[PDB]
Write an enzyme that holds these catalytic residues in place. Structure first.
Site, PDB file in Angstrom:
ATOM      1  N   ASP A  35       0.824  -1.199   0.000  1.00 10.60           N
ATOM      2  CA  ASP A  35       0.000   0.000   0.000  1.00 10.60           C
ATOM      3  C   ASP A  35       0.863   1.256   0.000  1.00 10.60           C
ATOM      4  O   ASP A  35       1.347   1.671   1.058  1.00 10.60           O
ATOM      5  CB  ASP A  35      -0.908  -0.017   1.240  1.00 10.60           C
ATOM      6  N   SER A 199      -0.757  15.626 -11.994  1.00 13.62           N
ATOM      7  CA  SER A 199      -1.014  15.264 -13.377  1.00 13.62           C
ATOM      8  C   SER A 199      -1.267  16.519 -14.202  1.00 13.62           C
ATOM      9  O   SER A 199      -1.809  17.498 -13.699  1.00 13.62           O
ATOM     10  CB  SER A 199      -2.212  14.309 -13.440  1.00 13.62           C
TER      11      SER A 199
END
Length: 330
Positions: A35, A199
């Site tokens: 994770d 992004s």
């Protein structure tokens, strides 16, 4: 040193991925959920409340000659999906894919929430976010990666998740045969303890690319792709019959649909998520309403590039002094 381990979807939907991990001496192999959105290595154990164990493999520290109680240490964690676990702490030898750390904090669960009990395939979590998020008190502990880093050939790990197929986690090296083209690197902020990056925009299907900054985290422990409501609405508007359902808890779509791809920007590069990756199947057995793999982050408080996004790429988690993230197509 290096390590290399295969990671395998837990079910037919790729809801999560498990990777075998050797703990203790002699080795006890547990299948852990790696994770990159948390920083605790915790396991089902001989200390876990018996009624809360249902099929998991447990770690038994009393059977490990290298286990040592970390005296006074406790831990307690809550995840974004509302699940939780807590317990005490041992140090022991931990190996992943041939890479060994001695003295790793292994957090032994005394209590786990129902969602963990109900998932027989996950024996615990191995956190790979920054150690500043580790929950051990009163002395915070380091992640497996942080402990291994100095010994690694290069201070990196990579995630290469499969779509309905196994993939690979590598530590200490970049497998140049595992991706196509070049890797595009992008800046990371560690301010919130995550692999947080921005992004450069998105496209829906064959549509034009929208240049827009989307701050989010690379999170292997989250199944879906959670993005701003504007972006998500633009995606599902291209699917006939798709709608957001408050009763179901997100966007659903007719199972008869063909889903468009979703592209996200990494600098000037583009990663394309095929439409099929966005299908999470019937909402309930036999239903013709299917659950979407792109959902709104509104009210999470953060955008999350979960498995839906990451499995479309070869992803480099670069833990150099100035961390960065790299993405390549594959």
């Amino acid at each position: 040193s290096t390590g290399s381990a295969t990671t395998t979807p837990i079910d037919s939907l790729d809801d999560a991925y498990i990777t075998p991990v050797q703990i203790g001496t002699p080795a006890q192999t547990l299948n852990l959920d790696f994770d990159t959105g948390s920083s605790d290595l915790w396991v089902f154990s001989s200390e876990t409340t018996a009624s809360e164990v249902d099929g998991q493999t447990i770690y038994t520290p009393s059977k490990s000659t290298t286990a040592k109680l970390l005296s006074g240490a406790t831990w307690s964690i809550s995840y974004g999906d509302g699940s939780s676990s807590s317990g005490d702490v041992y140090t022991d030898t931990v190996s992943v894919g041939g890479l060994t750390v001695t003295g790793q904090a292994v957090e032994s669960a005394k209590k786990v929430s129902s969602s963990f009990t109900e998932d027989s395939t996950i024996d615990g979590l191995l956190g790979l976010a920054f150690s500043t998020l580790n929950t051990v008190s009163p002395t915070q502990q380091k992640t497996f990666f942080d402990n291994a880093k100095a010994s690694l050939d290069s201070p990196v790990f990579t995630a290469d998740l499969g779509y309905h197929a196994p993939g690979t986690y590598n530590f200490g090296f970049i497998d140049t045969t595992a991706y196509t083209g070049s890797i595009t690197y992008t800046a990371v902020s560690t301010k919130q303890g995550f692999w947080e990056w921005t992004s450069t925009g998105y496209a829906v299907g064959s549509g034009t690319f929208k240049s827009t900054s989307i701050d989010g985290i690379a999170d292997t422990g989250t199944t879906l792709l959670y993005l701003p409501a504007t972006v998500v609405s633009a995606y599902w508007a291209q699917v006939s019959g798709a709608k957001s359902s408050s009763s179901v808890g997100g966007y659903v779509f007719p199972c008869s649909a063909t889903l468009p791809s979703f592209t996200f920007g990494v600098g000037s590069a583009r990663i394309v998520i095929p439409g099929d990756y966005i299908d999470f199947g019937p909402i309930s057995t036999g239903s013709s309403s299917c659950f979407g793999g792109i959902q709104s982050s509104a009210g999470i408080g953060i955008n999350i590039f979960g498995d839906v996004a990451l499995k479309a790429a070869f992803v480099v988690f670069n833990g150099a002094t100035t961390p960065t993230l790299g993405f390549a197509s594959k």
